[model samples]
Target: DTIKIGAQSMTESEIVANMIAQLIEHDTDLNTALVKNLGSNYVQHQAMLGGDIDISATRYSGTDLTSTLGKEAEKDPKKALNIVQNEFQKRFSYKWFDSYGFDNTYAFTVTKKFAEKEHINTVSDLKKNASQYKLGVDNAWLKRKGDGYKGFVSTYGFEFGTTYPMQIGLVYDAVKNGKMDAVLAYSTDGRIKAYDLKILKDDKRFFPPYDCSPVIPEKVLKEHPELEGVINKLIGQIDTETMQELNYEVDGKLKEPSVVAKEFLEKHHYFD
Candidate 1:
């Protein structure tokens, strides 16, 4: 039988899908797997339900992310889950467990040239100078509040979309070229490494926390219980900084996602 994995349609999501596939191929006996890059959180869930994929990436069980994007956008489909929580299993989630970065927000980054010129060194600086420049945010990050720049601005009576919503991949370019002034950037997103932008400090602490973990579907576990343990074991070994480096390889250096995943497992002895 073939093991299949899925992720929503962001570059990072696809990277996760590829990484999972690489690990499965290198470390496990599972010889067959498919890594699908379904667009959006909704698509990932839908594929899982449709039996098109065996697992999903970037999912927060019981998160509004699923409800907002899934066809049944009003109900909590993951309420039935009794698996590992997202607390330390994925990006930015920290609290009870070991958080690679506990008090973190998606950085509101600006160009080096601009930051030096405007003396914008922190979120406070941006809030104080909010009226002086326009801000850009990913549409997804714009709505959600998990480790992003939203809370900081709200605390200081400023907002991101008041000016415009910038494309996720475009914001770094826009800021670098001075087409825009600031962007709501993810802390671990590979673009920061690509663009050499200065991440404004969230000195006031605006963003909430969200951690990643292996979300084993209830249906799959009943069918193959051992699968949960294998995935969770892998999750336990991962953290934000580790993921950031992996993301940088795929997004920043243009490495093959599968190749990167295999190498990561080798380094951590996950293959053993």
Candidate 2:
């Protein structure tokens, strides 16, 4: 049987996809065919509808809540998860498996020297010294209406000294090399640790919680009842730090994603 696993183009997604594929193959007879670089998350969702893929590494609670279900960014984490899981099951014939135990939300990261020089610990702290900093972000983030540059400026009641818009992949490096004083980053990004950047707290809760969990097509699950048991072992297994370490192994250390996945599986003795 063809077991298609879907993932976006990001390195983190690549890491998760390899992990899932290795786990599934080790635990079952099926061989996984990874369909990666699926463009945006919505495109992957569309592919799932077409049965081009059998499982996605995850369908985030926050993404489904705001983008799919057409709900506002929710504050309460559990409520958001509940809403997404219920609506996801209803709207799409899919179900979310165990979560990875991390929320990969938007975060503002500054270099250690910059944060300490400006005495910045939280968004509030950044606000106090806002004009002293220059912010760099992805082009999409700069243009987004409600929660992007515009909303962030208004909600924080502050703006950086200057703003630079570039590709998402370039933003982190820009901040790390001091080309920009700060940049919007993902919470679980490996570069944060690698670059010694400080993740400023979002005291105002401007962004939504992006709790991630595996999403299996209902048809796929119904066909393989054993999948439920094997998949649930992922719950609480990968915390933010754990994921960041795995990501660094592949992205920074130049290791193959499959190698990283196999190491993780072996470390956990998933085969046994």
Q: Candidate 1 residues 40-98, lDDT tens each?
A: 45566567657777766455433323343221211222321222234223422211122
lDDT of 1 at 206: 48
lDDT of 1: 0.57
Count of clashing residue pairs in every prediction: 8, 0
The residue-by-residue lDDT of candidate 2 on 70-171, one tens digit each, is 787787888888888887788886887657888787788899898778888898898776787788876556655445677787888888888887766677
Which TM-score value belongs to model 1?
A: 0.72
Write down the worst ten-residue block by lDDT for model 1. Answer: 94-103
lDDT of 2: 0.81
Query: In model 2, what lDDT does residue 231 have?
Result: 75
Q: Best candidate per lDDT, number?
A: 2
lDDT of each: 0.57, 0.81
Task: Tell me the deviation in Å of residue 37 in model 2.
Answer: 1.2
